[PDB]
Amino acid sequence: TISKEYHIDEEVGFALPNPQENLPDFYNDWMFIAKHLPDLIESGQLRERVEKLNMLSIDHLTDHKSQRLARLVLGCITMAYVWGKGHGDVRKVLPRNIAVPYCQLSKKLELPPILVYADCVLANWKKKDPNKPLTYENMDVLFSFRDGDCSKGFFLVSLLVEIAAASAIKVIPTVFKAMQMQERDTLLKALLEIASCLEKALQVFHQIHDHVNPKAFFSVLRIYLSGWKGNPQLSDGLVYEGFWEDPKEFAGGSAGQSSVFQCFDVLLGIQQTAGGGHAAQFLQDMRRYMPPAHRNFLCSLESNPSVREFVLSKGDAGLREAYDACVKALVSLRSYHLQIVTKYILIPASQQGTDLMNFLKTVRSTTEKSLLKEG
Numbered sequence: 268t269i270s271k272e273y274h275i276d277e278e279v280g281f282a283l284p285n286p287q288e289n290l291p292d293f294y295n296d297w298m299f300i301a302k303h304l305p306d307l308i309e310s311g312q313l314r315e316r317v318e319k320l321n322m323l324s325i326d327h328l329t330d331h332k333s334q335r336l337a338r339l340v341l342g343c344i345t346m347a348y349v350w351g352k353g354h355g356d357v358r359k360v361l362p363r364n365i366a367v368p369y370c371q372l373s374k375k376l377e378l379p380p381i382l383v384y385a386d387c388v389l390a391n392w393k394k395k396d397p398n399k400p401l402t403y404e405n406m407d408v409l410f411s412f413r414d415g416d417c418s419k420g421f422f423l424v425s426l427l428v429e430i431a432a433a434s435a436i437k438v439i440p441t442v443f444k445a446m447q448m449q450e451r452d453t454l455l456k457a458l459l460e461i462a463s464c465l466e467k468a469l470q471v472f473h474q475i476h477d478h479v480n481p482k483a484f485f486s487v488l489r490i491y492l493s494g495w496k497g498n499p500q501l502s503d504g505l506v507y508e509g510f511w512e513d514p515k516e517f518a519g520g521s522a523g524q525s526s527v528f529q530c531f532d533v534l535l536g537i538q539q540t541a542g543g544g545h546a547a548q549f550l551q552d553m554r555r556y557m558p559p560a561h562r563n564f565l566c567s568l569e570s571n572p573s574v575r576e577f578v579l580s581k582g583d584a585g586l587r588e589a590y591d592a593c594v595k596a597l598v599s600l601r602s603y604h605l606q607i608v609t610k611y612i613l614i615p616a617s618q619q620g621t622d623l624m625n626f627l628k629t630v631r632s633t634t635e636k637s638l639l640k641e642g
């Protein structure tokens with residue numbers, strides 16, 4: 268069994284199990300703004316409502332779930348405040364009334380004061396009926412940015428892939444125990460169960476077409492998830508008034524911050540983070556935007572003996588085929604994902620991307636080159 272200190276759930280994996288939907292009454296002013304971003308932004312009332320807030324203390328957020336919900340509320344408000352209507356009129360100073368509690372809560376959770384994948388995907392969900400299974404029809408997001416932005420489809424389909432991966436994550440300890448105990452048959456069975464689970468996760472990706480449309484995703488959702496790191500619109504970063512004197516740069520919400528495929532890259536010895544390349548530097552940097560428990564899970568997998576080295580040292584075709592079935596399942600997920608990116612980003616950008624495609628192609632290439640046979 269995976270240690271409880273890694274915050275990995277048997278059912279939902281890296282996702283936050285049963286996230287909190289409501290904050291204590293003390294934070295009603297935060298919740299009102301966050302729940303009505305589409306309306307407040309469109310009417311030009313968002314920035315005024317934010318500037319009218321009183322500085323609320325974070326001491327009444329007494330557990331992980333309420334703190335995670337609060338991080339999500341303040342992060343969505345910060346994106347709406349900075350980007351406004353998403354047309355270029357930006358704010359370069361985040362008011363102290365929100366910047367101070369946001370940075371305090373971020374320091375406590377060891378995350379940067381910007382919306383990350385763990386907020387907008389991992390904690391941004393609920394079951395409609397708690398007695399029904401984790402299916403799209405029985406689920407919803409907690410917050411969106413604009414009407415018709417497809418954030419429910421995008422965040423929920425990412426979450427459903429994250430949940431499909433949970434059945435593979437839970438087999439990780441069986442793999443390491445079989446290697447330590449020198450139990451070849453147990454290792455082969457575990458590698459095939461991981462491959463089977465990752466193969467099932469591919470079908471989950473097909474749901475993206477039913478719930479997201481390219482125009483809205485490209486022109487709207489992409490704008491609100493942007494950060495202020497290497498961004499010409501906020502060339503020096505954002506001023507977090509009352510917390511830091513100088514403006515600070517933070518990258519926008521990204522699945523590069525996700526642990527879902529990354530723990531399988533680490534498990535299988537696919538060295539995505541090796542070297543000084545752009546792709547490797549970006550994946551390493553994005554670990555800082557990942558929850559500490561999850562960052563710790565990855566580095567502890569890196570400390571464990573190599574599964575690839577063990578499989579290569581045995582002269583066993585069945586073991587190599589089971590290992591390659593896991594690598595191939597990752598290649599298939601990344602190849603399908605590249606087709607999604609062509610439809611949702613490449614084509615809309617052409618009707619007005621290269622670096623995004625190159626990063627994804629490098630990660631997919633590194634995965635494919637790890638196959639022991641399929642060449």
Ligand code: HEM
Binds near residue numbers: 424528608623626627
């Ligand atoms: C509308 C659909 C989607 C689009 C347009 C899209 C786009 C992108 C882009 C452009 C990146 C590169 C990193 C960045 O620019 O921030 C990325 C990375 C990534 N995405 Fe998505 N994505 C989509 C759906 C999904 C879903 C549903 C998942 C499921 C969890 C997912 C998982 C990943 C992962 C794991 C990465 C990191 C790179 C890798 O490990 O291969 N994506 N995505």
Ligand SMILES: O[C@H](c1cccc2cncn12)C1CCCCC1
Binds near residue numbers: 421425
């Ligand atoms: O990398 C980002 C991201 C955020 C959240 C989930 C997710 C799934 N795949 C990519 N994801 C962004 C989102 C906006 C467009 C460019 C990529």
